[PDB]
């Protein structure tokens, strides 16, 4: 399609370690499991009060984050945002964008899919 670049982070395999996010916070394994494409996920980034993750958007596109809980929650921009069946999608701008907490959660997995302009 017109996707020029999905910027992928999974929890699991890469804790907070990414060159395309920034990432502020605290992982665990004790906060149960999320199920996506066919992946099981186990160790997450708790959205606490401090965490933050920010990154510039090279051309607007889709942000998703997959947590555990079906009605998760946070905030993009300062904007709260709730999840349908664990995940959130958010649609976005090029240029710089944070998330941060809106309730208690727990992410696993994140992707921004990118335009091609």
């Known amino acids: ?12 395999a890469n804790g907070t370690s990414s060159s395309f996010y920034t990432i502020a916070g605290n992982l ?6 999320a199920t996506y494409n066919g992946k099981t996920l186990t160790q997450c980034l708790k959205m606490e009060t401090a965490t933050s993750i920010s990154f510039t958007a090279p051309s607007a596109g889709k942000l998703t984050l997959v947590f555990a809980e079906a009605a998760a929650t946070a905030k993009v921009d300062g904007n ?37 302009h």
């Open 28 to 33: 665990s394994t004790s906060k149960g499991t």
């Open 1 to 12: 399609g017109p996707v020029a670049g999905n910027y992928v982070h999974d929890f699991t």
């Open 80 to 116: 709260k945002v709730t999840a349908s069946n664990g995940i959130i999608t958010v649609d976005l701008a090029q240029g710089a964008h944070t998330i941060t907490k809106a309730d208690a959660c727990n992410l696993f997995y994140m992707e921004y899919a990118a335009l091609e």
